[PDB]
Amino acid sequence: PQPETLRRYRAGEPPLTGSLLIGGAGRVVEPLRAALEKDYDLVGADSFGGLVFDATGITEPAGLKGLHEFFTPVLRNLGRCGRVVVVGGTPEAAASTNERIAQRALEGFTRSLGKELRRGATTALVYLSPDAKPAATGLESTMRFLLSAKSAYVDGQVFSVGADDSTPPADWEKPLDGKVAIVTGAARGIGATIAEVFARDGAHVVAIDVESAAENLAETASKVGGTALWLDVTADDAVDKISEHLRDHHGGKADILVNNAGITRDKLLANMDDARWDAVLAVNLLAPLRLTEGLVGNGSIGEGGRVIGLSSIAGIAGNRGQTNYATTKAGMIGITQALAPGLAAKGITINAVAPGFIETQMIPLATREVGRRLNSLLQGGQPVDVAEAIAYFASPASNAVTGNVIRVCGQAMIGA
Amino acid sequence: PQPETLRRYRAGEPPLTGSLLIGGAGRVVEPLRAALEKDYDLVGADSFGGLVFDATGITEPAGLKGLHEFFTPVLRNLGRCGRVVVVGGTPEAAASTNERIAQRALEGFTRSLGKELRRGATTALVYLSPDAKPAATGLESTMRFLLSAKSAYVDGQVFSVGADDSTPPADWEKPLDGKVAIVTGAARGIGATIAEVFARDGAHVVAIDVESAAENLAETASKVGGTALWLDVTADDAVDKISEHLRDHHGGKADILVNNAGITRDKLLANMDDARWDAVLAVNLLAPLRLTEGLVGNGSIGEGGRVIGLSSIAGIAGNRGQTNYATTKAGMIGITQALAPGLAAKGITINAVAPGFIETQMIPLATREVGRRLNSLLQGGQPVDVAEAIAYFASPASNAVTGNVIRVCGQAMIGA
Numbered sequence: 001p002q003p004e005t006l007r008r009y010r011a012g013e014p015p016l017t018g019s020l021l022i023g024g025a026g027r028v029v030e031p032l033r034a035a036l037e038k039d040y041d042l043v044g045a046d047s048f049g050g051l052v053f054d055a056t057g058i059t060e061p062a063g064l065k066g067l068h069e070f071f072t073p074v075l076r077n078l079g080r081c082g083r084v085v086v087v088g089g090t091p092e093a094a095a096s097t098n099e100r101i102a103q104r105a106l107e108g109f110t111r112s113l114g115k116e117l118r119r120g121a122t123t124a125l126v127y128l129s130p131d132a133k134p135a136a137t138g139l140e141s142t143m144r145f146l147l148s149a150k151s152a153y154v155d156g157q158v159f160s161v162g163a164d165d166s167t168p169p170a171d172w173e174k175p176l177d178g179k180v181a182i183v184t185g186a187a188r189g190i191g192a193t194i195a196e197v198f199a200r201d202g203a204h205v206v207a208i209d210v211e212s213a214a215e216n217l218a219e220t221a222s223k224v225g226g227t228a229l230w231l232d233v234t235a236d237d238a239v240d241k242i243s244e245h246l247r248d249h250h251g252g253k254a255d256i257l258v259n260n261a262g263i264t265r266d267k268l269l270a271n272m273d274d275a276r277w278d279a280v281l282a283v284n285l286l287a288p289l290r291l292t293e294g295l296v297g298n299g300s301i302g303e304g305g306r307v308i309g310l311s312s313i314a315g316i317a318g319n320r321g322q323t324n325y326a327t328t329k330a331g332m333i334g335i336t337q338a339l340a341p342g343l344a345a346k347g348i349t350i351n352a353v354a355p356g357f358i359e360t361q362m363i364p365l366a367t368r369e370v371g372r373r374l375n376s377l378l379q380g381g382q383p384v385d386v387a388e389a390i391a392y393f394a395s396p397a398s399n400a401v402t403g404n405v406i407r408v409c410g411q412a413m414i415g416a
Numbered sequence: 417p418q419p420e421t422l423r424r425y426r427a428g429e430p431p432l433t434g435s436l437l438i439g440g441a442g443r444v445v446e447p448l449r450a451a452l453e454k455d456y457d458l459v460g461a462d463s464f465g466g467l468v469f470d471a472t473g474i475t476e477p478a479g480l481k482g483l484h485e486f487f488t489p490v491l492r493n494l495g496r497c498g499r500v501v502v503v504g505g506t507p508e509a510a511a512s513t514n515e516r517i518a519q520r521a522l523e524g525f526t527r528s529l530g531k532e533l534r535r536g537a538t539t540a541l542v543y544l545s546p547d548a549k550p551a552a553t554g555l556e557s558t559m560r561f562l563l564s565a566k567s568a569y570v571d572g573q574v575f576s577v578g579a580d581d582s583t584p585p586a587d588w589e590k591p592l593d594g595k596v597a598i599v600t601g602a603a604r605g606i607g608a609t610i611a612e613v614f615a616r617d618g619a620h621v622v623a624i625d626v627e628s629a630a631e632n633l634a635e636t637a638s639k640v641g642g643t644a645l646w647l648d649v650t651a652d653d654a655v656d657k658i659s660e661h662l663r664d665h666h667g668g669k670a671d672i673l674v675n676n677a678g679i680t681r682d683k684l685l686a687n688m689d690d691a692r693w694d695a696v697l698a699v700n701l702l703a704p705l706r707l708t709e710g711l712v713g714n715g716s717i718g719e720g721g722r723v724i725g726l727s728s729i730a731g732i733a734g735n736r737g738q739t740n741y742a743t744t745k746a747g748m749i750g751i752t753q754a755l756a757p758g759l760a761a762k763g764i765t766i767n768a769v770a771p772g773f774i775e776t777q778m779i780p781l782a783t784r785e786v787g788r789r790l791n792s793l794l795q796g797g798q799p800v801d802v803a804e805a806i807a808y809f810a811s812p813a814s815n816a817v818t819g820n821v822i823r824v825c826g827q828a829m830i831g832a
């Protein structure tokens with residue numbers, strides 16, 4: 001069992017390595033073909049780049065034989081870095097309990113199969129609101145993300161698309177064109193690569209980070225063709241300083257806030273001081289809350305808005321030595337779920353990305369060299385992978401995706 | 417880092433190895449003291465058998481310093497096989513978004529700390545409906561379970577108690593006294609130990625299993641002082657045969673159905689025949705659905721009823737070689753969540769238990785000897801541990817606990 005060269009995004013290459021087959025039965029197979037004829041290579045015999053099963057048709061548990069009939073033949077013929085996606089209906093919203101039971105069981109299918117795919121290929125489960133108009137324009141951003149090299153490190157996860165219709169962006173290849181994005185913690189690591197990706201996709205980045213970071217930040221802003229605001233997100237006046245920086249540079253409006261800045265102060269709870277607790281709570285939790293309410297509250301972010309939070313696998317599964325940190329990363333899941341209704345009223349989505357083992361950076365190089373393999377893809381991921389998920393949510397056309405938590409972990413063995 | 421001798425249940429011993437401290441602030445600290453003065457050794461300096469933090473008081477994220485102030489002193493003083501429990505308010509039902517954010521973040525705290533406790537001790541998070549009457553009689557079955565040797569292999573999990581009031585059973589030491597319990601798959605393994613535990617707690621067991629099992633089943637029925645019904649739960653007439661067996665033996669009524677019978681037919685989806693798919697779907701999924709609707713539908717199980725399903729970690733995290741099996745075990749989570757409302761209307765709860773690495777039985781004795789350690793408690797569990805969780809749900813006084821999925825896994829590293 002050997003790790004694949006994961007194909008990542010590169011401009012001009014086709015989204016998939018092969019052709020796209022779209023089986024199954026229900027309200028999605030048809031309109032999905034129609035929406036993806038243009039940019040994909042539809043079947044139809046020869047190396048598959050992506051299998052997609054419409055599951056919405058399955059209305060009772062006996063129906064689940066369907067996955068077997070569609071998948072078992074085609075699997076041996078799945079490409080390098082191919083993409084399996086099962087599209088179902090939101091289980092809570094089904095028309096009968098029988099249907100709810102069947103759609104729920106799919107998660108068990110998609111996650112088990114993710115652990116069988118070979119040569120870097122991945123599975124995904126996507127639920128779609130049964131209130132979605134038949135075109136399902138609300139579903140395109142998610143399918144376009146999953147069926148591409150962009151999702152390289154996203155594996156085994158569950159996306160949940162709502163009812164609202166979506167406008168496609170002017171150019172799918174540059175989706176954040178003309179958007180203004182605030183990135184906290186942009187001097188280095190994942191935060192900087194978010195700036196890059198956001199820039200790549202056409203956005204103007206406000207790159208925020210502390211005085212200490214000094215110039216690492218300017219290097220990042222110059223690199224992405226953005227601006228640099230040297231600010232401690234925990235400062236009593238962070239909201240003022242940002243709204244003001246926006247007033248100068250972008251007429252007082254911003255489209256995307258990425259709450260990426262974070263710290264750790266790992267200690268066992270037993271030997272844990274107030275400063276290790278309080279310092280972590282302040283950056284990772286209070287500030288993202290305060291910044292999001294702040295910025296929406298004064299009109300800096302309005303209709304069409306996007307808030308994305310950085311959660312973590314620790315927030316989901318816990319981790320030894322991180323009761324503080326994990327509280328914050330679960331807290332961030334808390335922000336995403338609690339504010340989703342309010343913000344939806346205001347035309348704003350909010351979603352979270354939960355990284356697993358990312359290389360730049362991750363601790364004894366005795367546990368490093370192991371924890372990096374403990375996932376279906378057998379390798380550690382890269383900042384760009386996490387940034388791509390984040391760019392997906394930021395998309396002008398991801399307006400029907402809110403309240404989601406997606407791990408970017410290559411289906412890491414660990415979880416709740 | 418070395419595995420503890422887990423203290424399991426034994427009649428007459430005290431529920432805890434030490435004294436019970438109940439800190440924190442909110443609507444639960446007081447009434448909880450009152451309800452547990454009688455059977456527990458309340459503080460108050462010397463070896464703690466159980467720490468319990470009332471979290472319901474925490475209404476904004478800055479509040480979360482509370483866990484730190486209560487836990488950091490007391491932790492070094494935690495007994496052998498001690499029990500940490502944080503009791504919070506259902507996050508969805510909070511009065512403000514701020515409170516929802518704080519109560520949500522607790523999960524991250526309880527799971528991270530579970531990975532730090534020493535010498536077999538465990539954490540649990542329990543949410544309580546803010547509609548619960550101040551006495552919180554609905555919460556006693558859960559606290560009594562967690563704070564005992566009975567929960568020996570339950571670690572890091574999340575329980576969710578509703579609003580309804582509860583009557584205590586006549587004798588807490590024999591909670592299923594006079595109840596009639598149907599156990600499927602009782603000839604051996606976990607199913608038989610459920611019969612034992614159910615018998616121990618005063619119940620009359622109908623022990624069901626196939627013809628093949630022949631006598632293993634009679635040995636179990638004679639052992640528990642029950643009756644033996646030799647029946648393939650997938651048979652077109654399983655519901656008739658059981659209602660009829662009940663008509664003879666228990667005046668046509670049963671109080672508890674345990675949907676424990678299951679099989680595997682592990683194969684990779686790629687090389688998977690119809691019979692490995694269909695055979696597994698039929699026992700593990702269609703039959704538990706058909707049996708529960710069947711038995712409630714003809715009045716065999718009525719008000720005061722209890723349905724408990726056997727799910728699995730595979731159903732939650734997936735597993736290689738088990739797309740069929742995991743579909744069923746996720747399916748079983750599907751049954752528990754889909755039927756909870758309907759059945760609640762009828763005075764019936766339904767809940768699921770998801771075992772992890774249980775010894776009798778679990779595959780190469782090269783992966784056995786590893787997978788058994790991959791959990792906070794560093795050892796594989798035992799059938800009795802799984803049966804105890806199940807007996808907890810069956811309790812006459814667990815009427816405010818429905819729709820729950822609890823893993824019995826000693827906080828196994830693997831999950832979603």
Ligand SMILES: NC(=O)c1ccc[n+]([C@@H]2O[C@H](COP(=O)([O-])OP(=O)(O)OC[C@H]3O[C@@H](n4cnc5c(N)ncnc54)[C@H](O)[C@@H]3O)[C@@H](O)[C@H]2O)c1
Nearest residue numbers: 185187189190209210232233260261262310312355358361
């Ligand atoms: N594998 C890991 O990197 C991993 C895993 C899970 C989650 N995450 C999360 O993803 C995010 C990125 O982590 P990273 O690996 O790039 O670490 P990093 O430490 O390299 O990057 C964080 C940046 O945030 C900045 N920052 C810290 N406090 C700040 C403050 N108060 N105000 C403004 N800026 C501040 C730091 O200067 C730093 O430049 C974090 O939120 C982290 O918690 C990381």
Ligand SMILES: NC(=O)c1ccc[n+]([C@@H]2O[C@H](COP(=O)([O-])OP(=O)(O)OC[C@H]3O[C@@H](n4cnc5c(N)ncnc54)[C@H](O)[C@@H]3O)[C@@H](O)[C@H]2O)c1
Nearest residue numbers: 601603605606625626648649676677678726728771774777
């Ligand atoms: N560690 C593991 O044991 C583990 C892990 C997770 C979940 N589970 C689940 O817990 C339950 C118990 O498993 P077990 O380890 O005791 O395995 P087991 O095979 O020893 O016990 C199952 C019993 O069910 C009986 N049975 C099978 N099909 C039946 C049918 N159609 N009708 C009536 N009886 C039938 C079998 O005869 C057997 O006696 C199963 O549902 C299993 O899926 C087990």
